[PDB]
Amino acid sequence: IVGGESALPGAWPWQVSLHVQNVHVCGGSIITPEWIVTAAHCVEKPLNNPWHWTAFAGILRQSFMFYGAGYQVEKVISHPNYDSKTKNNDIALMKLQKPLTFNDLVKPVCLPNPGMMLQPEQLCWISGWGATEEKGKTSEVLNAAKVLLIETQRCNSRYVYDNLITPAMICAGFLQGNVDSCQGDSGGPLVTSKNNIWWLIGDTSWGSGCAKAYRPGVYGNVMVFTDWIYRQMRADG
Amino acid sequence: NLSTLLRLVHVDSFSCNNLDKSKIFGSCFNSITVDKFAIPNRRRDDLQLGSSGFLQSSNYKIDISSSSCQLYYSLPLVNVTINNFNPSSWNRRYGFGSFNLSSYDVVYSDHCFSVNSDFCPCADPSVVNSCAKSKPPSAICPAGTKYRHCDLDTTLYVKNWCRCSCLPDPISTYSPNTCPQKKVVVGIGEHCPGLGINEEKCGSSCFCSPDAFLGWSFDSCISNNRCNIFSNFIFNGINSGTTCSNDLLYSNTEISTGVCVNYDLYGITGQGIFKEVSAAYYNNWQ
Amino acid sequence: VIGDFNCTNSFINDYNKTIPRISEDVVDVSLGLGTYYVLNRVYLNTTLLFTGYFPKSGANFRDLALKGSIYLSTLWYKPPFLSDFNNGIFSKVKNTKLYVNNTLYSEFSTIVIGSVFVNTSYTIVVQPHNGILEITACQYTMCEYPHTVCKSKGSIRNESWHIDSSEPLCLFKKNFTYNVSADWLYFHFYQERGVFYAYYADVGMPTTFLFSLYLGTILSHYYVMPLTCNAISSNTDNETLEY
Ligand SMILES: *[C@@H]1O[C@H](CO)[C@@H](O[C@@H]2O[C@H](CO)[C@@H](O)[C@H](O)[C@H]2NC(C)=O)[C@H](O)[C@H]1NC(C)=O
Ligand SMILES: *[C@@H]1O[C@H](CO)[C@@H](O[C@@H]2O[C@H](CO)[C@@H](O)[C@H](O)[C@H]2NC(C)=O)[C@H](O)[C@H]1NC(C)=O
Ligand SMILES: *[C@@H]1O[C@H](CO)[C@@H](O)[C@H](O)[C@H]1NC(C)=O
Ligand SMILES: *[C@@H]1O[C@H](CO)[C@@H](O)[C@H](O)[C@H]1NC(C)=O
C-alpha cells in the first residue's frame, strides 16, 4: 500500500493473513466461518501439504504469538482451470478445521449477488500487509488506501497493458500513480459501499510494481466465479 | 483627435466597457495602451465581453475591471502582410521553425502549455538500449536539463518493456501530473509560454519533428475582400496627465470677417473687425 | 551632486582645482547684442521703450564648459559650478566644428535648468543633436553624475545622464533647427510670475523667440553638463569648449 494511512482498529473483520514457516507470505478473506478466500498463485506445487498452515484473525500488528494460537488449515481447494503463464482464474479456497465462532471484531462479508449494477467510477478500498514505497519489507501495522475502478476497455490500451486483461479480470486504481500495492499483498479484500453493506468484488492476483505510472493494479473479478464457490460448499457436505 | 481616427480607418464597430463615449470627446488622461491583433472568422464570437473561448484562454485576455473600449475595423488586402511568429522561447530552443501557411491566414492558439527551465523532450540513449516494446527515440540533450523520465519494468513475462511519461500526447494524457508539460491559461497582458510537443517524434542533437508540435490551428480572415483586425484601447487614469483631447472646444473654426468677433488669439482678449490685407513682414516666429 | 541616483562609479576622482575663466570684450548693446525681439509681436517703424530682463552694460562672463577624457571629478558637480538661477542668464556659445572624412559635425554642451532635480519636480534640458535642438521639460530622473558624450569621434564611454524604464509626464516637447555652419549661438532664459521663457539665435545681433511655458513654481538652480570626447585635446585638432 502506497500513499495510504495506518488502519485504526475499527470494523474491518474480513482480512485473514496466512502464515507458513512462521513467516507471513499471503493473506486472504473470509465469507463464511468454514472457508477462506485467497489467491491461487501462492498454492502452487511447492506450497503443498496444507497441514503446515496457520491463520490469524483480529490481529493488526503481526506480533502476538509464535508457532501457536492459530487455526490449522485442513484442506485447500484451488481452481482447476488455472494457468501459470497468463495468471487466469487465480482464486483458491482454504478450509479451516475450527468452527471459528463469531465474536468481537469477527464478522465476514457476504458474497456479491449477480446483477449489482456497479458504477463505472466506483469507489473501493484496499488493505493488506506489504511494502511501503518500493521493494520494502512487510508492514508491521495494518494500512489501507482508497482506489477507483477503471474500465476494462481503457485498461486494454496498447500503452498500459496492450490487451493483456481477460474478461474474468478487472482493473482498478489510479492511472496517475502513487496509489498501488507492492509485492506481498496477496489476496486482499476489495470491498465497496453499496446499500449500507460491503461487497467483496475484487481479489489481488498480480501487478507490475507499485506507485508507477500507467501500471494500475489487477484485481480478480469474483462475479464469474460466484457459481464455482457455491459448488465447492455443497460438495463438501 | 477622435474625428481624424475614425475617418482614416474603416471602422465597423466601436463599443466601450465601463466607460462612456460622451466623456471621451474632451478629457485628459495619463497614458493609452493599444493592443492590435487579427480576428478569426470561426472564433469571431470569442472576442465578446467575457467568454471562455480559445482566444481568451491562450492568445489574449481582455480585462473587465478597467475602463476600456473595443474597436472593430477592416483593412484592404492590397499591400498587406500577416506576421506569424512564435513568442515561445523553449520551443525554438530545440529547433522550431514556422507554420509555413498560405497568405491571408492567421494562427491562433487553443492548447497552451508552460514548462520550467529544467525540461528536455529527449531521453538518455544509454537507458533506452534495454527496451523492446514501445522504444522511444533518444539523443544527447544539452547540459542543464534532465533527460526524459522512462522506467523499465516487467508486467507478466516481458523483460524489456520501457514506460515513459507524456503518453500519448500532452494535449490528452492519462497522467498529467507525471508529464512535466502542464496546461496554463494566459493572464492580463501575457503570452503563451509554449505549445505541446510530441516527445515520440523528438530526437545528433535533440531535434523534434516539425509535425510533433500540436495544439494549434489556423483559419482565414477574409470578409468582403478585406481583413478584420481587432483593436483594444485601455485608459490609465482620468482627469490628470497631459494626453488631452483636441476637438473638445477648438475644432479649427473658420474666420468670419465683416462683423466684430471676440478674441482668444495666443492669449489676448478683445473685439475687432477682420480685414484681409496682403502682408509680408511676418516671420516664422511672429 | 546634481541628482539622487547612481549612474556609474568607474574611475571617479576625488578633487581638482577647476578654476573658472573670465574673458574680455564685455557686452555692447550699441548694435543689438544682449537684446531680444518681443514674444510674438511685430513692431513697425517707431521707437519702443520696453522694460524687460536685459544684462548690464559692461559685464564679464564665466566659462562653465567642462571637457573630460577618461576620469570625472567630484568638484565638477559642486559650487561655484552649480550657480543660482536668480532672474535669468544670457549665454554666448560656439559650435565646435569637427572634420571627419570631409564631413562637418558641430556639437556643444548641454544646459539643464531646474529646482531640485528630482522625480516629483520638472527639469528643462536643451541638448543639440547634429543641428537639432531637443527642448523638453519633463520629470526626468537625474543621477548624481550627469554627463554627455560626443557622436562624432565617439569616446570610450556611453552617454548616461538619466535612467527611466517608462516615459514620465512632460509639459513641453518640440524640436528646433539651426545653421550647422554657424560660428556663435545665443540664448536667453528668464522667468516672471511663474512662467518660463526661452530664446535662441544663430546669426545676427538680436535673439528670436522659442516658446513660453507655465510651471507655477520658482526655479532656483541650473547646471551645464560636461562633454566627454576625444577630439578636444591639444594632440588632436586644436579646438576648445566655451560656455
Ligand atoms: C519712420 O518714422 C520716423 C519717425 O516718425 C519718420 O520720420 C518722420 O516722418 C514724418 C512723416 O513723413 C516727417 O514729417 C518727419 O519729418 C520725419 N522726421 C525725420 C526726423 O525724418 C519716418 O518718415 C518714418 N519712415 C517711413 C514712414 O518710411
Ligand atoms: C528630436 O530629434 C531627436 C533626434 O533626431 C529625436 O530623437 C530620436 O527619436 C527617435 C524616435 O524615438 C529615435 O528612434 C532616435 O534614436 C532618436 N534620436 C536620438 C539622437 O536620440 C526626437 O524624437 C525628436 N523630437 C521630436 C518631438 O520629434
Ligand atoms: C455693417 O458694417 C460691417 C462692417 O463695416 C459690414 O461688414 C456690414 O456689411 C454692414 N452691414 C450692412 C447691412 O451694411
Ligand atoms: C549658414 O552659414 C553659412 C556661413 O555663414 C551661410 O553661407 C549660410 O547661408 C547659412 N545658412 C542659413 C540657412 O542661414
mmCIF file with all atom_site columns, N, CA and C in Angstrom, chain B residues 176-228:
data_model
loop_
_atom_site.group_PDB
_atom_site.id
_atom_site.type_symbol
_atom_site.label_atom_id
_atom_site.label_alt_id
_atom_site.label_comp_id
_atom_site.label_asym_id
_atom_site.label_entity_id
_atom_site.label_seq_id
_atom_site.pdbx_PDB_ins_code
_atom_site.Cartn_x
_atom_site.Cartn_y
_atom_site.Cartn_z
_atom_site.occupancy
_atom_site.B_iso_or_equiv
_atom_site.pdbx_formal_charge
_atom_site.auth_seq_id
_atom_site.auth_comp_id
_atom_site.auth_asym_id
_atom_site.auth_atom_id
_atom_site.pdbx_PDB_model_num
ATOM 1   N N  . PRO B 1 176 ? -1.532  13.567 -16.290 1.00 0.00 ? 176 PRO B N  1
ATOM 2   C CA . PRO B 1 176 ? -0.965  14.909 -16.492 1.00 0.00 ? 176 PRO B CA 1
ATOM 3   C C  . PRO B 1 176 ? 0.071   15.292 -15.449 1.00 0.00 ? 176 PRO B C  1
ATOM 4   N N  . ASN B 1 177 ? -0.028  14.758 -14.229 1.00 0.00 ? 177 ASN B N  1
ATOM 5   C CA . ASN B 1 177 ? 0.923   15.128 -13.185 1.00 0.00 ? 177 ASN B CA 1
ATOM 6   C C  . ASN B 1 177 ? 2.303   14.537 -13.451 1.00 0.00 ? 177 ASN B C  1
ATOM 7   N N  . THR B 1 178 ? 2.357   13.335 -14.031 1.00 0.00 ? 178 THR B N  1
ATOM 8   C CA . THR B 1 178 ? 3.648   12.721 -14.325 1.00 0.00 ? 178 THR B CA 1
ATOM 9   C C  . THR B 1 178 ? 4.366   13.437 -15.460 1.00 0.00 ? 178 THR B C  1
ATOM 10  N N  . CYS B 1 179 ? 3.623   13.959 -16.427 1.00 0.00 ? 179 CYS B N  1
ATOM 11  C CA . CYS B 1 179 ? 4.232   14.683 -17.535 1.00 0.00 ? 179 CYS B CA 1
ATOM 12  C C  . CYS B 1 179 ? 4.594   16.096 -17.091 1.00 0.00 ? 179 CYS B C  1
ATOM 13  N N  . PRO B 1 180 ? 5.820   16.560 -17.352 1.00 0.00 ? 180 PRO B N  1
ATOM 14  C CA . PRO B 1 180 ? 6.191   17.915 -16.917 1.00 0.00 ? 180 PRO B CA 1
ATOM 15  C C  . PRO B 1 180 ? 5.412   19.011 -17.619 1.00 0.00 ? 180 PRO B C  1
ATOM 16  N N  . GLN B 1 181 ? 4.928   18.766 -18.835 1.00 0.00 ? 181 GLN B N  1
ATOM 17  C CA . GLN B 1 181 ? 4.142   19.765 -19.548 1.00 0.00 ? 181 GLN B CA 1
ATOM 18  C C  . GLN B 1 181 ? 2.760   19.878 -18.916 1.00 0.00 ? 181 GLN B C  1
ATOM 19  N N  . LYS B 1 182 ? 2.419   21.075 -18.444 1.00 0.00 ? 182 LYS B N  1
ATOM 20  C CA . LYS B 1 182 ? 1.150   21.327 -17.779 1.00 0.00 ? 182 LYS B CA 1
ATOM 21  C C  . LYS B 1 182 ? 0.417   22.456 -18.487 1.00 0.00 ? 182 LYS B C  1
ATOM 22  N N  . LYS B 1 183 ? -0.907  22.340 -18.555 1.00 0.00 ? 183 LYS B N  1
ATOM 23  C CA . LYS B 1 183 ? -1.715  23.362 -19.203 1.00 0.00 ? 183 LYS B CA 1
ATOM 24  C C  . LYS B 1 183 ? -1.700  24.651 -18.391 1.00 0.00 ? 183 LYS B C  1
ATOM 25  N N  . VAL B 1 184 ? -1.648  25.781 -19.093 1.00 0.00 ? 184 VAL B N  1
ATOM 26  C CA . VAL B 1 184 ? -1.615  27.093 -18.462 1.00 0.00 ? 184 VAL B CA 1
ATOM 27  C C  . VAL B 1 184 ? -2.582  28.012 -19.198 1.00 0.00 ? 184 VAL B C  1
ATOM 28  N N  . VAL B 1 185 ? -3.108  28.995 -18.474 1.00 0.00 ? 185 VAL B N  1
ATOM 29  C CA . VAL B 1 185 ? -4.025  29.990 -19.021 1.00 0.00 ? 185 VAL B CA 1
ATOM 30  C C  . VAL B 1 185 ? -3.328  31.343 -18.994 1.00 0.00 ? 185 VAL B C  1
ATOM 31  N N  . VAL B 1 186 ? -3.367  32.052 -20.123 1.00 0.00 ? 186 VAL B N  1
ATOM 32  C CA . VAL B 1 186 ? -2.720  33.355 -20.208 1.00 0.00 ? 186 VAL B CA 1
ATOM 33  C C  . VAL B 1 186 ? -3.448  34.355 -19.316 1.00 0.00 ? 186 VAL B C  1
ATOM 34  N N  . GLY B 1 187 ? -2.688  35.298 -18.766 1.00 0.00 ? 187 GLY B N  1
ATOM 35  C CA . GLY B 1 187 ? -3.216  36.320 -17.894 1.00 0.00 ? 187 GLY B CA 1
ATOM 36  C C  . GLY B 1 187 ? -3.392  37.651 -18.596 1.00 0.00 ? 187 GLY B C  1
ATOM 37  N N  . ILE B 1 188 ? -3.478  38.709 -17.794 1.00 0.00 ? 188 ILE B N  1
ATOM 38  C CA . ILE B 1 188 ? -3.644  40.060 -18.322 1.00 0.00 ? 188 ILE B CA 1
ATOM 39  C C  . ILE B 1 188 ? -2.306  40.513 -18.899 1.00 0.00 ? 188 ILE B C  1
ATOM 40  N N  . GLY B 1 189 ? -2.261  40.711 -20.213 1.00 0.00 ? 189 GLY B N  1
ATOM 41  C CA . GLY B 1 189 ? -1.037  41.142 -20.867 1.00 0.00 ? 189 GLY B CA 1
ATOM 42  C C  . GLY B 1 189 ? 0.071   40.112 -20.853 1.00 0.00 ? 189 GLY B C  1
ATOM 43  N N  . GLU B 1 190 ? -0.264  38.841 -21.064 1.00 0.00 ? 190 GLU B N  1
ATOM 44  C CA . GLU B 1 190 ? 0.713   37.764 -21.074 1.00 0.00 ? 190 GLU B CA 1
ATOM 45  C C  . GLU B 1 190 ? 0.485   36.875 -22.287 1.00 0.00 ? 190 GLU B C  1
ATOM 46  N N  . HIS B 1 191 ? 1.582   36.369 -22.843 1.00 0.00 ? 191 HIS B N  1
ATOM 47  C CA . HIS B 1 191 ? 1.542   35.489 -23.998 1.00 0.00 ? 191 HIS B CA 1
ATOM 48  C C  . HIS B 1 191 ? 1.575   34.031 -23.545 1.00 0.00 ? 191 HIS B C  1
ATOM 49  N N  . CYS B 1 192 ? 1.455   33.126 -24.509 1.00 0.00 ? 192 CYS B N  1
ATOM 50  C CA . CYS B 1 192 ? 1.506   31.700 -24.209 1.00 0.00 ? 192 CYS B CA 1
ATOM 51  C C  . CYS B 1 192 ? 2.958   31.245 -24.098 1.00 0.00 ? 192 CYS B C  1
ATOM 52  N N  . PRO B 1 193 ? 3.351   30.617 -22.987 1.00 0.00 ? 193 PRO B N  1
ATOM 53  C CA . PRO B 1 193 ? 4.745   30.158 -22.859 1.00 0.00 ? 193 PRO B CA 1
ATOM 54  C C  . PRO B 1 193 ? 5.166   29.166 -23.930 1.00 0.00 ? 193 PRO B C  1
ATOM 55  N N  . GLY B 1 194 ? 4.260   28.326 -24.410 1.00 0.00 ? 194 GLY B N  1
ATOM 56  C CA . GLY B 1 194 ? 4.613   27.374 -25.446 1.00 0.00 ? 194 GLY B CA 1
ATOM 57  C C  . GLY B 1 194 ? 3.485   26.403 -25.702 1.00 0.00 ? 194 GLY B C  1
ATOM 58  N N  . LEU B 1 195 ? 3.638   25.658 -26.792 1.00 0.00 ? 195 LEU B N  1
ATOM 59  C CA . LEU B 1 195 ? 2.662   24.670 -27.221 1.00 0.00 ? 195 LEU B CA 1
ATOM 60  C C  . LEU B 1 195 ? 3.159   23.266 -26.905 1.00 0.00 ? 195 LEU B C  1
ATOM 61  N N  . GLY B 1 196 ? 2.248   22.303 -27.012 1.00 0.00 ? 196 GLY B N  1
ATOM 62  C CA . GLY B 1 196 ? 2.603   20.923 -26.733 1.00 0.00 ? 196 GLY B CA 1
ATOM 63  C C  . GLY B 1 196 ? 3.487   20.340 -27.822 1.00 0.00 ? 196 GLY B C  1
ATOM 64  N N  . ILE B 1 197 ? 4.498   19.585 -27.398 1.00 0.00 ? 197 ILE B N  1
ATOM 65  C CA . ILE B 1 197 ? 5.446   18.945 -28.299 1.00 0.00 ? 197 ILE B CA 1
ATOM 66  C C  . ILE B 1 197 ? 5.363   17.439 -28.091 1.00 0.00 ? 197 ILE B C  1
ATOM 67  N N  . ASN B 1 198 ? 5.149   16.702 -29.177 1.00 0.00 ? 198 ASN B N  1
ATOM 68  C CA . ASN B 1 198 ? 5.083   15.246 -29.113 1.00 0.00 ? 198 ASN B CA 1
ATOM 69  C C  . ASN B 1 198 ? 6.484   14.685 -28.912 1.00 0.00 ? 198 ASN B C  1
ATOM 70  N N  . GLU B 1 199 ? 6.722   14.074 -27.750 1.00 0.00 ? 199 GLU B N  1
ATOM 71  C CA . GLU B 1 199 ? 8.038   13.522 -27.451 1.00 0.00 ? 199 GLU B CA 1
ATOM 72  C C  . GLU B 1 199 ? 8.354   12.285 -28.281 1.00 0.00 ? 199 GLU B C  1
ATOM 73  N N  . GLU B 1 200 ? 7.340   11.637 -28.858 1.00 0.00 ? 200 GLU B N  1
ATOM 74  C CA . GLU B 1 200 ? 7.578   10.446 -29.664 1.00 0.00 ? 200 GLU B CA 1
ATOM 75  C C  . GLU B 1 200 ? 8.283   10.762 -30.977 1.00 0.00 ? 200 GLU B C  1
ATOM 76  N N  . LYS B 1 201 ? 8.183   12.000 -31.464 1.00 0.00 ? 201 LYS B N  1
ATOM 77  C CA . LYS B 1 201 ? 8.809   12.403 -32.717 1.00 0.00 ? 201 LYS B CA 1
ATOM 78  C C  . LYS B 1 201 ? 10.015  13.311 -32.496 1.00 0.00 ? 201 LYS B C  1
ATOM 79  N N  . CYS B 1 202 ? 10.559  13.336 -31.284 1.00 0.00 ? 202 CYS B N  1
ATOM 80  C CA . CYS B 1 202 ? 11.727  14.143 -30.967 1.00 0.00 ? 202 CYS B CA 1
ATOM 81  C C  . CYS B 1 202 ? 12.994  13.300 -31.049 1.00 0.00 ? 202 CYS B C  1
ATOM 82  N N  . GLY B 1 203 ? 14.114  13.971 -31.296 1.00 0.00 ? 203 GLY B N  1
ATOM 83  C CA . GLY B 1 203 ? 15.397  13.300 -31.401 1.00 0.00 ? 203 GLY B CA 1
ATOM 84  C C  . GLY B 1 203 ? 15.589  12.575 -32.718 1.00 0.00 ? 203 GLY B C  1
ATOM 85  N N  . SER B 1 204 ? 22.842  12.588 -33.161 1.00 0.00 ? 204 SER B N  1
ATOM 86  C CA . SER B 1 204 ? 22.911  14.039 -33.297 1.00 0.00 ? 204 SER B CA 1
ATOM 87  C C  . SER B 1 204 ? 22.176  14.731 -32.154 1.00 0.00 ? 204 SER B C  1
ATOM 88  N N  . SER B 1 205 ? 21.996  16.043 -32.283 1.00 0.00 ? 205 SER B N  1
ATOM 89  C CA . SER B 1 205 ? 21.306  16.808 -31.258 1.00 0.00 ? 205 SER B CA 1
ATOM 90  C C  . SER B 1 205 ? 19.812  16.493 -31.264 1.00 0.00 ? 205 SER B C  1
ATOM 91  N N  . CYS B 1 206 ? 19.173  16.748 -30.124 1.00 0.00 ? 206 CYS B N  1
ATOM 92  C CA . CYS B 1 206 ? 17.741  16.514 -29.976 1.00 0.00 ? 206 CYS B CA 1
ATOM 93  C C  . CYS B 1 206 ? 16.973  17.523 -30.821 1.00 0.00 ? 206 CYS B C  1
ATOM 94  N N  . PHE B 1 207 ? 16.409  17.061 -31.934 1.00 0.00 ? 207 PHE B N  1
ATOM 95  C CA . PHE B 1 207 ? 15.668  17.913 -32.860 1.00 0.00 ? 207 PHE B CA 1
ATOM 96  C C  . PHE B 1 207 ? 14.294  17.296 -33.081 1.00 0.00 ? 207 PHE B C  1
ATOM 97  N N  . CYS B 1 208 ? 13.269  17.899 -32.485 1.00 0.00 ? 208 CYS B N  1
ATOM 98  C CA . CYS B 1 208 ? 11.913  17.394 -32.634 1.00 0.00 ? 208 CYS B CA 1
ATOM 99  C C  . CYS B 1 208 ? 11.408  17.610 -34.057 1.00 0.00 ? 208 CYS B C  1
ATOM 100 N N  . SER B 1 209 ? 10.540  16.707 -34.498 1.00 0.00 ? 209 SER B N  1
ATOM 101 C CA . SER B 1 209 ? 9.972   16.813 -35.833 1.00 0.00 ? 209 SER B CA 1
ATOM 102 C C  . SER B 1 209 ? 9.026   18.009 -35.905 1.00 0.00 ? 209 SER B C  1
ATOM 103 N N  . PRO B 1 210 ? 8.965   18.700 -37.047 1.00 0.00 ? 210 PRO B N  1
ATOM 104 C CA . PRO B 1 210 ? 8.037   19.836 -37.164 1.00 0.00 ? 210 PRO B CA 1
ATOM 105 C C  . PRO B 1 210 ? 6.577   19.440 -37.053 1.00 0.00 ? 210 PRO B C  1
ATOM 106 N N  . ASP B 1 211 ? 6.234   18.184 -37.339 1.00 0.00 ? 211 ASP B N  1
ATOM 107 C CA . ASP B 1 211 ? 4.863   17.715 -37.190 1.00 0.00 ? 211 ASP B CA 1
ATOM 108 C C  . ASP B 1 211 ? 4.529   17.305 -35.763 1.00 0.00 ? 211 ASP B C  1
ATOM 109 N N  . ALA B 1 212 ? 5.508   17.315 -34.856 1.00 0.00 ? 212 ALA B N  1
ATOM 110 C CA . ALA B 1 212 ? 5.260   16.938 -33.471 1.00 0.00 ? 212 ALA B CA 1
ATOM 111 C C  . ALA B 1 212 ? 4.647   18.066 -32.654 1.00 0.00 ? 212 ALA B C  1
ATOM 112 N N  . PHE B 1 213 ? 4.687   19.299 -33.155 1.00 0.00 ? 213 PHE B N  1
ATOM 113 C CA . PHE B 1 213 ? 4.121   20.440 -32.445 1.00 0.00 ? 213 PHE B CA 1
ATOM 114 C C  . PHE B 1 213 ? 2.608   20.430 -32.625 1.00 0.00 ? 213 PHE B C  1
ATOM 115 N N  . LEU B 1 214 ? 1.885   20.106 -31.556 1.00 0.00 ? 214 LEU B N  1
ATOM 116 C CA . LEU B 1 214 ? 0.434   20.031 -31.583 1.00 0.00 ? 214 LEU B CA 1
ATOM 117 C C  . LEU B 1 214 ? -0.158  21.037 -30.604 1.00 0.00 ? 214 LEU B C  1
ATOM 118 N N  . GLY B 1 215 ? -1.410  21.406 -30.856 1.00 0.00 ? 215 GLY B N  1
ATOM 119 C CA . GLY B 1 215 ? -2.100  22.361 -30.012 1.00 0.00 ? 215 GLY B CA 1
ATOM 120 C C  . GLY B 1 215 ? -2.269  23.717 -30.665 1.00 0.00 ? 215 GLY B C  1
ATOM 121 N N  . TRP B 1 216 ? -2.477  23.726 -31.980 1.00 0.00 ? 216 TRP B N  1
ATOM 122 C CA . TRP B 1 216 ? -2.661  24.970 -32.713 1.00 0.00 ? 216 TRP B CA 1
ATOM 123 C C  . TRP B 1 216 ? -3.441  24.678 -33.985 1.00 0.00 ? 216 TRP B C  1
ATOM 124 N N  . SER B 1 217 ? -4.083  25.720 -34.508 1.00 0.00 ? 217 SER B N  1
ATOM 125 C CA . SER B 1 217 ? -4.832  25.626 -35.752 1.00 0.00 ? 217 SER B CA 1
ATOM 126 C C  . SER B 1 217 ? -4.784  26.981 -36.444 1.00 0.00 ? 217 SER B C  1
ATOM 127 N N  . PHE B 1 218 ? -5.454  27.071 -37.591 1.00 0.00 ? 218 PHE B N  1
ATOM 128 C CA . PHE B 1 218 ? -5.475  28.308 -38.358 1.00 0.00 ? 218 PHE B CA 1
ATOM 129 C C  . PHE B 1 218 ? -6.807  28.429 -39.081 1.00 0.00 ? 218 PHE B C  1
ATOM 130 N N  . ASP B 1 219 ? -7.110  29.652 -39.510 1.00 0.00 ? 219 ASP B N  1
ATOM 131 C CA . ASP B 1 219 ? -8.345  29.935 -40.225 1.00 0.00 ? 219 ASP B CA 1
ATOM 132 C C  . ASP B 1 219 ? -8.185  31.252 -40.968 1.00 0.00 ? 219 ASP B C  1
ATOM 133 N N  . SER B 1 220 ? -8.866  31.358 -42.105 1.00 0.00 ? 220 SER B N  1
ATOM 134 C CA . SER B 1 220 ? -8.797  32.568 -42.907 1.00 0.00 ? 220 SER B CA 1
ATOM 135 C C  . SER B 1 220 ? -9.519  33.717 -42.208 1.00 0.00 ? 220 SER B C  1
ATOM 136 N N  . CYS B 1 221 ? -9.200  34.939 -42.641 1.00 0.00 ? 221 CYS B N  1
ATOM 137 C CA . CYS B 1 221 ? -9.793  36.148 -42.083 1.00 0.00 ? 221 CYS B CA 1
ATOM 138 C C  . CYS B 1 221 ? -10.247 37.096 -43.186 1.00 0.00 ? 221 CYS B C  1
ATOM 139 N N  . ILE B 1 222 ? -10.698 36.551 -44.310 1.00 0.00 ? 222 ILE B N  1
ATOM 140 C CA . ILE B 1 222 ? -11.137 37.353 -45.445 1.00 0.00 ? 222 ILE B CA 1
ATOM 141 C C  . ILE B 1 222 ? -12.646 37.537 -45.360 1.00 0.00 ? 222 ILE B C  1
ATOM 142 N N  . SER B 1 223 ? -13.088 38.793 -45.331 1.00 0.00 ? 223 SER B N  1
ATOM 143 C CA . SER B 1 223 ? -14.508 39.124 -45.308 1.00 0.00 ? 223 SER B CA 1
ATOM 144 C C  . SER B 1 223 ? -14.736 40.318 -46.219 1.00 0.00 ? 223 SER B C  1
ATOM 145 N N  . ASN B 1 224 ? -15.520 40.113 -47.280 1.00 0.00 ? 224 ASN B N  1
ATOM 146 C CA . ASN B 1 224 ? -15.779 41.147 -48.284 1.00 0.00 ? 224 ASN B CA 1
ATOM 147 C C  . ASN B 1 224 ? -14.476 41.682 -48.874 1.00 0.00 ? 224 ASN B C  1
ATOM 148 N N  . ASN B 1 225 ? -13.551 40.766 -49.173 1.00 0.00 ? 225 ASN B N  1
ATOM 149 C CA . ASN B 1 225 ? -12.238 41.101 -49.730 1.00 0.00 ? 225 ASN B CA 1
ATOM 150 C C  . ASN B 1 225 ? -11.454 42.040 -48.816 1.00 0.00 ? 225 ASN B C  1
ATOM 151 N N  . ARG B 1 226 ? -11.680 41.936 -47.507 1.00 0.00 ? 226 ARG B N  1
ATOM 152 C CA . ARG B 1 226 ? -10.986 42.760 -46.528 1.00 0.00 ? 226 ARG B CA 1
ATOM 153 C C  . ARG B 1 226 ? -10.644 41.911 -45.312 1.00 0.00 ? 226 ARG B C  1
ATOM 154 N N  . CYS B 1 227 ? -9.577  42.300 -44.621 1.00 0.00 ? 227 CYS B N  1
ATOM 155 C CA . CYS B 1 227 ? -9.107  41.595 -43.437 1.00 0.00 ? 227 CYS B CA 1
ATOM 156 C C  . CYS B 1 227 ? -9.589  42.308 -42.180 1.00 0.00 ? 227 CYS B C  1
ATOM 157 N N  . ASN B 1 228 ? -10.071 41.529 -41.216 1.00 0.00 ? 228 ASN B N  1
ATOM 158 C CA . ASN B 1 228 ? -10.592 42.058 -39.963 1.00 0.00 ? 228 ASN B CA 1
ATOM 159 C C  . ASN B 1 228 ? -9.498  42.043 -38.904 1.00 0.00 ? 228 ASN B C  1
#
